[PDB]
């Protein structure tokens, strides 16, 4: 009933996903997942007032999209002007029984959507090519994880700076934070942002050190809002 399906259901020979900020391969369907299947994940915008998102569909097991196979691209436009992290974009990867992939992106504000259809692996890749991709991925796992963690740390630092700035500029925190503390926060945030813009190829420990620097300024101030 449920174990006899293990032999009857076909599987996805390669992980399928899309490019997220930093050139990261974000998989929505993992290699060896049974098909037909549907996986959904919600994403947001990278920059302030971003008018749309570029959905870049990749296949492969490596951490960075440049080291995987590009399947296609489409844009979802019409996003209302909003700060980074505000719009919610629902992305769905759907594989039918014939291995055909439909990738859909939907704006949660309007339900506005766009999509792309991609043929199965059998008509694009040889078993040799697929196995090769898997092999190469296994061979370079540690390196790939280093890269992934690097980008993760960068995104975390940038998001933290933007969120701190947003927090202290929010009208809700007017009078909760002193103007002086607000100035401390904003100054440190601007310094961190300049650093980020000037150091695109920085490593994990550098990003982390910088985030800790920002935290040294911000944490006692935010913590003070919640004191007994």
């Amino acid at each position: 009933e449920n174990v006899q399906d293990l032999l009857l259901l076909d599987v996805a020979p390669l992980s399928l996903g899309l490019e997220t900020a930093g050139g990261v391969m974000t998989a929505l369907i993992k290699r060896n997942s049974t098909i037909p299947t549907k996986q959904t994940q919600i994403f947001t915008t990278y920059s302030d007032n971003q008018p749309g998102v570029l959905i870049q569909v990749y296949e492969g097991e490596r951490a960075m999209t440049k080291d995987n196979n590009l399947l296609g691209r489409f844009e979802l436009s019409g996003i209302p002007p909003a700060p980074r992290g505000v719009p919610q974009i629902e992305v769905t990867f759907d594989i039918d029984a014939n291995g055909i992939l439909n990738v859909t992106a939907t704006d949660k504000s309007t339900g506005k959507a766009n999509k792309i259809t991609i043929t199965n692996d059998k008509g694009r890749l040889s078993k040799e090519e697929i196995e090769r991709m898997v092999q190469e991925a296994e061979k370079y796992k540690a390196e790939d994880e280093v890269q992934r963690e690097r980008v993760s740390a960068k995104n975390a630092l940038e998001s933290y700076a933007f969120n701190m700035k947003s927090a202290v500029e929010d009208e809700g925190l007017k009078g909760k934070i002193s103007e002086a503390d607000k100035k401390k926060v904003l100054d440190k945030c601007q310094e961190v942002i300049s650093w980020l813009d000037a150091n695109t190829l920085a490593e994990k420990d550098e990003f982390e050190h910088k985030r800790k620097e920002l935290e040294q300024v911000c944490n006692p101030i935010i913590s003070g809002l919640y004191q007994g």
Binding site: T20, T26, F43, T44, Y46, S47, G52, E75, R84
Partner: peptide, 7 residues
Amino acid sequence: NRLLLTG
């Protein structure tokens, strides 16, 4: 967490 998409 929310992951980010460029335009």
